[PDB]
Nucleic acid binder design. Structure first.
Ligand SMILES: [Mg+2]
Ligand SMILES: [Mg+2]
Ligand SMILES: [Mg+2]
Ligand SMILES: [Mg+2]
Ligand SMILES: [Mg+2]
Ligand SMILES: [Mg+2]
Ligand SMILES: [Mg+2]
Ligand SMILES: [Mg+2]
Ligand SMILES: [Mg+2]
Ligand SMILES: [Mg+2]
Ligand SMILES: [Mg+2]
Ligand SMILES: [Mg+2]
Ligand SMILES: [Mg+2]
Ligand SMILES: [Mg+2]
Ligand SMILES: [Mg+2]
Ligand SMILES: [Mg+2]
Ligand SMILES: [Mg+2]
Ligand SMILES: [Mg+2]
Ligand SMILES: [Mg+2]
Ligand SMILES: [Mg+2]
Ligand SMILES: [Mg+2]
Ligand SMILES: [Mg+2]
Ligand SMILES: [Mg+2]
Ligand SMILES: [Mg+2]
Ligand SMILES: [Mg+2]
Ligand SMILES: [Mg+2]
Ligand SMILES: [Mg+2]
Ligand SMILES: [Mg+2]
Ligand SMILES: [Mg+2]
Lengths: 87, 128, 200, 90
RNA sequence: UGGUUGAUCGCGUCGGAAGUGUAAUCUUGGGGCUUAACCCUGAGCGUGCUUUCGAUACGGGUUGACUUGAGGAAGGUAGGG
RNA sequence: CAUUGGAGAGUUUGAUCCUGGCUCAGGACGAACGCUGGCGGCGUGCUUAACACAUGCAAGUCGAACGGAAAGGCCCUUGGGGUGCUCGAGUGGCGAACGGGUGAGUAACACGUGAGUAACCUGCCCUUGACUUUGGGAUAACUUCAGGAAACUGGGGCUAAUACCGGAUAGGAGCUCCUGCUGCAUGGUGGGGGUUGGAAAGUUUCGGCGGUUGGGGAUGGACUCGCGGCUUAUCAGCUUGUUGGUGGGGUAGUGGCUUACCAAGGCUUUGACGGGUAGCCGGCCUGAGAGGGUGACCGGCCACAUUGGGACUGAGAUACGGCCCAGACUCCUACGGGAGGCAGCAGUGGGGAAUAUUGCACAAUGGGCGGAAGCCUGAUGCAGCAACGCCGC
């Protein structure tokens, strides 16, 4: 870079990328845990995993790592899957 | 942010501003959401015309004036109607008034001293 | 940007007295030069061009500005030749000439460009200043005793002032009653021919 | 009860046309014809455009005069929906 | 592209209304630069489009009549088709 | 129940009339050249090499978020008080996505015009309702060590926040169930219930200035669509995620956007596909008009920033003066490895018939940050240069 503002910016961009990547990977792991519970067909495990995943999606949306609309979409998918499992 | 600012127009060394409403990102002399008034500072007691209803609407909707437009609104009294403050509100003095027909009728009749200072300049050529 | 050469040559070529009288125009029936006495064909262009050049050299206006006057008259409503002659008469130097404060239009241009005149309070040194109605042209107070001015003051009684101007000779004040009409401009050209010329 | 600014006003585009293809599921290709002046010679021409609508239940057939209303993009090419069948030519 | 005519629709067509057609330009009315070029300002233009309300003479759509265009039947009939 | 507007000429013959081409008189220009050249006013000035670029500048700001003290500045026997203003370097916030440039690509919902989003997002600003709770762990700077020619890199120790991370508490966020009124199909909206959940930050010279979250407003953007504007048939077939369906995924959002499965579609002689050329427009020139030509300045939209590709950060990204990879180039190197992108302003080389100063100022208007004084601004305002245009003398 040629501007010290831009050098500061590349440093902060890397830092924010680390933070956001960590949060997104955690979200993906939680959603995968719920999906595997749903495939296994358990009810209590799937319910607990769904609660955890929805809470973490909302937490990430609050942190700004993901958009609130994306959080809502993923939560809706998880809740609909859990409802189908219960039915 | 939406701003109420001045859009420059006119010639070199002769600026006339249009008090317009546009967002900050837009270029100075560009498309405006609305044209509110005009401001000719080059003229005597600068001309300041501001559409009171529209400027009140834009202030109430949250447009941010530039310092120049704040001065103009102070002079037009709009900056007191909105954000009530104790300011003189010096509504523009008029840039005086000339006339032509009255002067022509005055001189057509002036006659007398017209040709009178005229024969006085006859005496002047005598002096010349 | 101003014709400074002889005017009698142009008057002889154009066949009419551009200005003045009782002069070297006793050789009028033939244009200047070695080939002056020969018989002429005179096409329509020739005729039209002669009328246009007569107006131009009478009023001291070059071709670009005369053309501009032509488009202004053409755009204006009414007879194009009438409007064109009205504009040329509304020129300030011609106004001074017609009021009679100058011996000729060239002298009027000289004094106007030298600034010996005031237009309704404001000093003007533009010969092409188009005088508007109800205007008051005044001689500059410093220059109220010019030799040409005193000659005009001695001679104006013989000169005829048109109806659209009022002059306070000794006072040097030309009141413009109205902007002149075709019947008030003296007929010495064919404005219709000029208009036809500017259409080819 | 007290709903918000009702009416929505904002009306969508409506086209009357003729079905020219019904052989794909839940879709009918409608041919809509308009009459306009020729820009230069002034004759009233006939401009025809093919519009793909969404026909839930496959209720329309070849040669049927139908009415379609514009919608949001329902597929890569479908942007209209069948609202009624005016003449069932069959 | 369309003979005569009844009914109907109101797509073309025609007439209002609303919205839009930024500004500048352009036309034009005022004003400022000593005039002009140029500049400011009011209006027009923006030849369209959308929405909406009317008109139904014509074009067209739908629908029903009529026989004069067109075709057919029966009889007559000419010919190196 | 009138118009503002239309000019020809020469040339086929021995002569004539007609047909007919050619040529000319007019206007114009982002023009060049030749001869000539006084001034002023207002504009305009690389149309070719989106050719390669030396040098300076063109994006910073905030101490009223933070640790601090490398300078200046006050108070003290030279260091010492961070002590107050101030203040490099560092964290943190915001800006850097604007402004400015160019027209290479693009025959395309790119643009013009008019609509739709019941498929959308929107920082700062305005408005209104709730709030601003309880804890914790690091780290840059600094310090020490090691490595490197450099660019710089890696350890040890140490430290603060409006930096970062647990928790509590908050709807109009997920799911679900009643019920009112309703639209344009998917539906929209009012009311109630169940259930699972989502925040925050402090600071001040006490004058301030801020934080989080609902709902509206304004602003800006996004997508979809009807209609409109080139040439070529000596290009006739094009397409297989292609056309549609269902489930999932994805996204701010609809969607073959993506995926699996099913079906066999979709486009085209009213010109698909291919070739050629081209940014589009408000406008400009010409013309009686209809048209024809054109897309300089100025203004709107789009595209692009060494070539190709990619994401990251962010409210927002073709990210001009960002990052990553590759190619072509230029430069530094101690040969191990590094650095760079004027189609920003001025300028150089080059090409060309041809197009300017390595200027001044932030005084005005506009923009960024700051509570403010203020700082930054090659935007802009100006000046220099050239008869390049118009106008006046
Ligand atoms: Mg993992
Ligand atoms: Mg989904
Ligand atoms: Mg008929
Ligand atoms: Mg009828
Ligand atoms: Mg105007
Ligand atoms: Mg004037
Ligand atoms: Mg306009
Ligand atoms: Mg009919
Ligand atoms: Mg028979
Ligand atoms: Mg012959
Ligand atoms: Mg011959
Ligand atoms: Mg500092
Ligand atoms: Mg731009
Ligand atoms: Mg352009
Ligand atoms: Mg925080
Ligand atoms: Mg098209
Ligand atoms: Mg699907
Ligand atoms: Mg091109
Ligand atoms: Mg074009
Ligand atoms: Mg432009
Ligand atoms: Mg992001
Ligand atoms: Mg950048
Ligand atoms: Mg930019
Ligand atoms: Mg650059
Ligand atoms: Mg340059
Ligand atoms: Mg050369
Ligand atoms: Mg300022
Ligand atoms: Mg200030
Ligand atoms: Mg600077």
């Amino acid at each position: 870079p040629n501007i010290k503002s831009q050098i500061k910016r590349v440093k902060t961009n890397e830092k924010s990328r680390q933070r956001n990547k960590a949060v997104k990977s955690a979200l993906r792991t939680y959603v995968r845990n719920f999906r595997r519970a749903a495939e296994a067909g358990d009810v209590e495990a799937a319910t607990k995993a769904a609660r955890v995943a929805n809470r973490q999606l909302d937490k990430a949306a609050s942190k700004g790592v993901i958009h609130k609309n994306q959080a809502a979409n993923r939560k809706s998918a998880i809740s609909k899957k859990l409802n189908s499992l219960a039915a | 942010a939406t701003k109420i600012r001045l859009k420059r127009l006119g010639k070199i060394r002769t600026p006339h501003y249009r008090v317009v409403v546009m967002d900050s990102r837009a270029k100075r002399d560009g498309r405006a959401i609305e044209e509110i008034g005009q401001y000719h500072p080059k003229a005597d007691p600068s001309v300041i015309v501001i559409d009171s209803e529209r400027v009140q609407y834009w202030l109430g909707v949250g447009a941010q004036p530039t310092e120049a437009v704040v001065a103009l609104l102070k002079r037009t009294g709009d900056w007191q109607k909105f954000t009530g403050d104790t300011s003189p509100s010096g509504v523009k003095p008029q840039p005086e008034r000339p006339n032509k027909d009255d002067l022509f009728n005055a001189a057509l009749a002036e006659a007398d001293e017209a040709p009178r200072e005229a024969i006085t300049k006859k005496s002047e050529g005598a002096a010349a | 940007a101003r014709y400074t050469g002889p005017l009698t040559k142009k008057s002889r070529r154009l066949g009419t007295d551009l200005v003045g009288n009782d002069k070297s125009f006793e050789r009028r029936p033939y244009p200047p030069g070695v080939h002056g006495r020969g018989r002429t064909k005179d096409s329509e262009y020739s005729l039209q061009l002669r009328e246009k050049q007569k107006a131009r050299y009478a009023y001291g206006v070059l071709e670009k500005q005369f053309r501009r006057y032509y488009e202004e008259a053409d755009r204006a409503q009414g007879k194009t030749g009438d409007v064109l002659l009205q504009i040329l008469e509304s020129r300030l130097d011609n106004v001074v000439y017609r009021a009679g404060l100058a011996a000729t239009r060239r002298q009027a241009r000289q004094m106007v460009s030298h600034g010996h005149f005031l237009v309704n309070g404001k000093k003007v040194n533009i010969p092409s200043y188009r005088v508007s109605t109800h205007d008051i042209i005044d001689v500059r107070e410093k220059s109220k005793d010019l030799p040409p001015i005193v000659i005009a003051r001695e001679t104006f009684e013989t000169r005829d002032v048109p109806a659209w101007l009022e002059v306070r000779p000794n006072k040097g004040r030309i009141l413009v009653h109205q902007l002149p009409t075709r019947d008030q401009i003296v007929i010495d050209v064919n404005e219709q021919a000029i208009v036809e010329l500017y259409s080819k | 009860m007290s709903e918000n600014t009702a009416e929505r006003t904002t009306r969508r585009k409506v086209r009357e046309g003729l079905v020219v293809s019904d052989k794909m599921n839940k879709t009918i290709t409608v041919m809509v014809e308009d009459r306009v002046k020729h820009p230069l010679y002034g004759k009233v021409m006939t401009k025809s455009v093919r519009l793909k609508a969404h026909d839930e239940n496959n209720e329309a057939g070849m040669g049927d005069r139908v009415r379609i209303m514009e919608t949001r993009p329902l597929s890569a090419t479908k942007r209209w929906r069948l609202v009624e069948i005016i003449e069932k030519a069959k």
